[PDB]
Design a protein around this nucleic acid. Structure first.
Lengths: 123, 123
RNA sequence: GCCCGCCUGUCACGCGGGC
RNA sequence: GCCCGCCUGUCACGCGGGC
């Protein structure tokens, strides 16, 4: 229900209809979601509807990926924001890599509680 | 220089790489370009690159068509979105007619400032 | 009340693929 | 037709939240 970790997932990994997908979009949203104290190293946001993402946690749109992870059946518009400069202290300058691929998540009680953020270091 | 009418021309009439050419695309882009309040009667979008469209104002890709208007030499992929109910008030339902034909524009300072939208009343 | 989100029903459209 | 997928709208209830 009101699983705080699910809602923490959305704060850090969900933006339904992004208003941009450049570095500015990252630097704005990475601050709006509180990830700029200290600068979070890298963070990916998923776009689209929420039901598609929750459905990953069940058979409709999900498959077993690893020890405690699940891979989505369909691909998602996503944006990955990576910190550059080498300074953990804000200003938290970012560079954006938008993409389109399947996402990996951990699930608890049919809910995404974490994003496998590792697959997005690679692009 | 003052390029503001060209800037409105692109916002109202240009989508380089449309994401569909069906009713969904129309209703999506008519909302995305803010044209839905009230519902614009009809509005046509041009696809392709900008230079082809600017060239209608020079002899490279244009000829005098009628009064202060010019017809393109080449044809364009275009999509015309027409309103469905007739009520200018939302919801703004649109039906799409994709086409491939010459476009007519008025030109100032080598730039399209208006589209002759009448030719698209004819499907 | 206005807005956003969740969830359900009901009107209903639109596109693509496989068989 | 059937399956899979994408993408949306109207209206009505219910729940959470902002004003």
């Amino acid at each position: 229900q009101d699983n705080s970790r699910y809602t923490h997932f959305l704060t850090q990994h969900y933006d339904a209809k992004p208003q941009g997908r450049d570095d500015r979009y990252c630097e704005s949203i990475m601050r709006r979601r509180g990830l700029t104290s200290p600068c979070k190293d890298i963070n990916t946001f998923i776009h689209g509807n929420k039901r598609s993402i929750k459905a990953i946690c069940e058979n409709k749109n999900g498959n077993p990926h690893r020890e405690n992870l699940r891979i989505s059946k369909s691909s998602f518009q996503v944006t990955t924001c990576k910190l550059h400069g080498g300074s953990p202290w804000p200003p938290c300058q970012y560079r954006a890599t938008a993409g389109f691929r399947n996402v990996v998540v951990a699930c608890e009680n049919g809910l995404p509680v974490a994003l496998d953020q590792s697959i997005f270091r690679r692009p």
